[PDB]
Structures are given as C-alpha cells and as structure tokens.
Amino acid sequence: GSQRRQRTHFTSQQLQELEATFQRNRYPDMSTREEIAVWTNLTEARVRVWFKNRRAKWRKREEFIVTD
Numbered sequence: 001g002s003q004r005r006q007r008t009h010f011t012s013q014q015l016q017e018l019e020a021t022f023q024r025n026r027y028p029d030m031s032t033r034e035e036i037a038v039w040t041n042l043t044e045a046r047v048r049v050w051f052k053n054r055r056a057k058w059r060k061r062e063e064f065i066v067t068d
Contacts, residue, residue: 010050014040018050019066027051 010018021028021036028036033051034044042050057065 008042008046010042010046014042018047018054022051022054026055 017040018036025032030044033047037044037047040047
C-alpha cells in the first residue's frame with residue numbers, strides 16, 4: 001500500500017563500506033557500482049555522487065576532509 005519511492009543519505013556504516021569499496025577499486029563499472037549500491041541499500045546515482053565526492057576530496061588542497 002502507498003508509494004515505495006524514498007530518499008537516503010550516507011550512514012557511518014555505508015561510508016565505511018564505500019571506503020572499503022574505494023580501497024578495492026577507485027572507479028568500478030556502472031553494474032559493479034549498482035551491485036555495491038544494492039549491498040549498501042543506496043541508489044546507483046547516490047553511489048555515483050559518492051565516487052565524484054571522494055575523487056574531489058582526493059584532488060583538492062583541503063585538510064581533514066575524510067575521517068581517520
């Protein structure tokens with residue numbers, strides 16, 4: 001019953017599964033990004049924004065932009 005369509009943002013466990021995904025492969029195929037989106041319970045578009053954000057954080061001059 002009712003509409004199934006929903007919106008999501010990255011949890012502390014989704015961020016760490018995506019860091020482990022990035023350490024394994026920094027630029028996966030679109031079907032591989034969709035499988036890890038299913039496994040994190042995200043959309044492949046929110047995952048593509050995460051890879052773009054992670055690449056921007058790698059490229060930029062700024063400090064402490066990723067937690068360690």
